[PDB]
């Protein structure tokens, strides 16, 4: 004999499906009150109940605000992964102490690193502007080597010295 | 005192006191003297069958003698925790099964009401960011203890939120255990049970998925860290645990 | 043989065997030859009275036939967990409470040693950086289970730390579970006792504050995140849960 | 009815119903009419003798009118946490011990087979980044439950893995509670058991060092703050917990 | 009849009051050595134990120590809430590669960045002066809005830019 | 009568030891199959299991990797423990807007600035040289002062100003 295929419903959702056998009493087994009804067998868990009727699980809810927030966050900590903090604040004293001399004076290091932060801060803020003018596109490829490009040799090299 | 009257007190006697030498199952030796002390330690301590339910659904068979039915000991089934996406927040473990535990029930001789035991939870776990399924209820004699329900998915950068843990309804149960409510995600431990303990996360990147120690215990919920993708563990189904005096097998 | 002795002998056997019939109180049917084996069925696994104890302070009325509690199972109360201020610093989780079970123990019909149950641990919400207050001892027949300790109220910067649970003492019971202590802050979990599950802190803006799942249970303590003033959730009370055969009502 | 097959049956008959009253252990008074319901309450209320194992190893006395054994529950040992050297990774937690319970498990009087619970994980705080001790098992009657894992010794910034938690083995038990595993170390709890209750790391610059609540329970491990160098809690050994009926004192 | 009020002393602390019915006999119910003493209803859990005489809880001490610790790590993370540390190092690059040139050749933009950068160095140091000067003051009113002065427009358009 | 000293080996290696009266049946007690032996009581808890023999544990790996990755974590975050996050923001945007101006035009204070972050890089950098050449000697004595430098009263001077 049939099976039947009864669902908890609480508030317009189902949350728990089960298979029983129809002779079967749900008062006598789930007590006074339980909130079992009978469901078709394409119902599964997580469902509206609207009227006399199992809606299907309503699509996520798309937020322009949390893709934006995603994008900047992928994009947020990946400048101290492929840059430590400890380099980074290396980086920053040395500039700051060569740009604190007359550029006439500076070593031929010293204008080096220089033009080297200055192939940085292009490479980051081309990786920011990419990244944020993303949305539109929601991180479909093109994506990952061309929403962040390669670094060129100089970006290496910084990050092997500090 | 007439000639008849003793002779019916006698049989009425030896009819009394031998109903209980095979109310325990053992033959009238007129030569032990004791019988086991009139069997009543294989009346008390012994015939002292356990039963153990873990089928989704099933009529109990109660023997013909047994009539009470004490320490009826429920689990509800407990609810997998949420996946993590690769970003670095917290996916929320799932909720812990509720339980009850009813003494010196009634039970007419004959079958049982069906029990219906708590599948556990299945994960979610096709996708990133996908809540976890929520574990079955245990439902015997009117008296159903909800499983709990299950984690949630998380997104980049927002820790999910807490989810309730199971709860008592029905015939109410003289002792109820209310399950272990799933966290909010950062410690991300999955709720206990009666029978279970709360299960943590375990950091890997590949997803290990340790699940809940035992029954009705909820998954610990998943977890990212350096791009891993941890679905998050399973729950674990609930059981029901049954005592009863029969001289009958269990 | 004695034309009397025998008949007193018989009186005697006759007036053995149906005091048993009484002693849980059934008919003395001369037709039915079982009468629930001699009352054995009714008498050990029904007639099973169990009674949960939740009043602060009471009187136990003990049936006239009892002579022998077992089973005599008690937790103490939990303590809430501490305030958290608007800063950065997490609060405590209040401990949860004792518990003892003990087995046998012999009580004079009559009334009983007042039992007191231990109120669970208010909040001291009035006001930020605060600890909550510990929740109180649950006492029974010369033996405690004392409440677990209150929570730790939290200034700026400086997480707490964490404070004891609860302890037995008085006559030592068989088996003494210590109560679950509470925690220092960072992970901010209420202790747990024999009927309960370490409480989680619950991260939000409004001061949801959920409690401990069950009896014994400890408060998860407050908590701050963006601005917010979690006071910390409240602890619970303890039960007594006693079982005694009597042919009487609980 | 022959003259002698009445003295016979009534014969059987006196000597069937004391043999019940010196079952119990009472004397044959023939004036009281009841005595205790002829030994019953004695024998289902009373004599109920709890018996608490904690030696390492020993031969259980069983009276010799003990038949059968009702109730033995036994809990593994726990694992002591690893240390945590001067640097800022935390330790592992190790994992709590196993256990299991069974019901009319069958004795033959006289001696027992020899109980042996397991010892308490010993801490490994003679020097930093070591792996604590694991607990030994506990076994009795062909079942054992082992005993849980112990800690991970953590270097500098890399906190250790999880460890597993007890088992059961040997004859399946009715009923067992895998044990409590221990965490990876963040979180840092030890597991807990059936008698006892996740316990969690305690932060201190003194290695103030809290063990696990009760019997079974696991290390919460060590942790380095401010160049602190707590090793680590101690484990709490396993007991084991036999009920039976019997006159003779336990 | 009556009900006494009585109170469990630890180390001259009181941690649990109850009230319970005079006719009880508390060695009979809490066993052997409980701790309990009899109190008046006016105490409270919490308050100290002197002789014969239950003293009330003593107040909280004041630390200037805590006052100061509170009143800079309420304005520590403030720094990172109102710019954040991505938004920190991109400014942090920006003004010191500006600084590198001269700054006759250096950009309008430039200039115009140096100055924004003035101005918020100049805001940041007066709200850490106001904040050091507020333990005489406890945080009182003149408080929040006057101890955070709200930034000047530049403020908000360089965290806006970058 | 003796004791047996036996120990339970799980894949060679034995993970707990035992001593129990030679009388006992170790079958009847831990069931079926148990994995206890017979072991010398020299054995303890986590040794290896090679052929018939109980090897002692293996002495711990001595990874250089190891030992590079702690002495730089070591000295990684005491830059951020002797100063600050905050101040570390200080001192960059005192740097940078005084190399901003001309060095004719900044001020006394300006150029004791520059010099006090010139030995501080000084310092720095001598610092994490002395902890890089450490792996050869394994941070032993000279250790701690030596592998750090007390620092100029410049440097505690801008860490308490700052």
Redesign the interface.
């Known amino acids: 004999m049939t099976d039947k295929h009864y669902a908890?419903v609480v508030d317009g959702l189902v949350?728990?499906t089960?298979?029983?056998?129809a002779d079967?009493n749900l008062d006598?087994?789930?007590?006074?009150?339980?909130g079992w009804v009978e469901a078709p067998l394409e119902v599964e868990?997580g469902w509206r109940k609207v009227g006399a009727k199992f809606a299907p699980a309503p699509p996520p809810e798309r937020d322009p605000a949390?893709i934006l927030?995603?994008l900047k966050?992928?994009a947020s900590?990946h400048i101290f992964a492929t840059i430590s903090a400890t380099a980074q604040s290396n980086l920053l004293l040395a500039v700051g102490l060569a740009s604190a001399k007359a550029p006439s004076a500076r070593t031929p290091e010293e204008r080096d690193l220089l033009n080297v932060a200055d192939e940085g801060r292009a490479w980051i803020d081309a990786v920011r502007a990419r990244v944020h003018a993303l949305a539109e596109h929601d991180g479909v490829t093109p994506k990952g080597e061309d929403r962040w490009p390669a670094p060129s040799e100089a970006v290496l090299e910084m990050a092997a010295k500090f | 005192?007439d000639v008849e009257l003793?002779?019916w007190?006698?049989w009425?006697?030896?009819?009394?006191?031998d109903?209980?030498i095979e109310?325990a199952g053992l033959t009238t030796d007129?030569t032990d003297?004791?019988?086991?002390?009139?069997a009543?330690?294989?009346?008390?301590?012994?015939?002292?069958?356990?039963v153990?339910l873990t089928a989704?659904?099933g009529n109990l068979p109660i023997p013909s003698?047994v009539?009470?039915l004490?320490w009826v000991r429920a689990v509800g089934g407990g609810g997998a925790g949420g996946n993590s996406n690769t970003?670095?927040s917290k996916a929320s473990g799932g909720g812990?099964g509720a339980g009850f535990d009813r003494?010196?029930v009634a039970v007419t001789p004959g079958s049982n009401?069906?029990y219906?035991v708590?599948a556990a939870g299945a994960v979610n776990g096709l996708g990133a960011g996908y809540n976890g399924?929520?574990?079955?209820?245990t439902?015997?004699?009117?008296?159903?203890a909800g499983?709990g329900?299950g984690g949630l998915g998380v997104?980049?950068?927002?820790?999910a939120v807490?989810v309730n843990?199971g709860t008592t309804?029905?015939?109410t149960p003289?002792?109820?255990?209310?399950?272990?409510?799933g966290?909010?995600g950062?410690?991300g431990?999955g709720?206990?049970?009666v029978?279970?303990?709360?299960?943590?996360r375990?950091?890997?990147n590949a997803g290990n998925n340790?699940p809940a120690?035992?029954w009705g215990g909820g998954g610990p919920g998943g977890s990212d860290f350096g791009g891993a993708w941890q679905p998050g563990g399973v729950g674990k189904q609930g059981i029901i645990?049954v005592?009863?005096?029969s001289r009958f097998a269990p």
Chains 1, 5, 6 share one sequence.
């Open positions: 908890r949350v728990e089960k298979t029983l056998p079967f006598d087994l789930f007590g006074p009150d339980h868990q949390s927030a995603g966050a992928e900590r | 005192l003793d002779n007190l006698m009425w006697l030896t009819g009394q006191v109903g209980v109310g007129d003297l004791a019988r086991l002390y009139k009543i330690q294989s009346m008390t301590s012994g015939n002292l069958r356990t153990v989704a659904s003698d009539s009470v004490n970003g670095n812990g003494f010196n009401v069906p219906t708590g399924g929520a574990g079955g209820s439902a015997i004699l009117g008296t159903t499983g329900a997104n980049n950068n927002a820790t807490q843990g309804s029905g015939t003289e002792i109820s255990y209310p399950g272990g409510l966290t909010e950062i410690v431990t709720g206990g049970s029978l279970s303990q709360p299960t943590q375990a950091f890997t340790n120690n035992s645990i005592q009863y005096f």
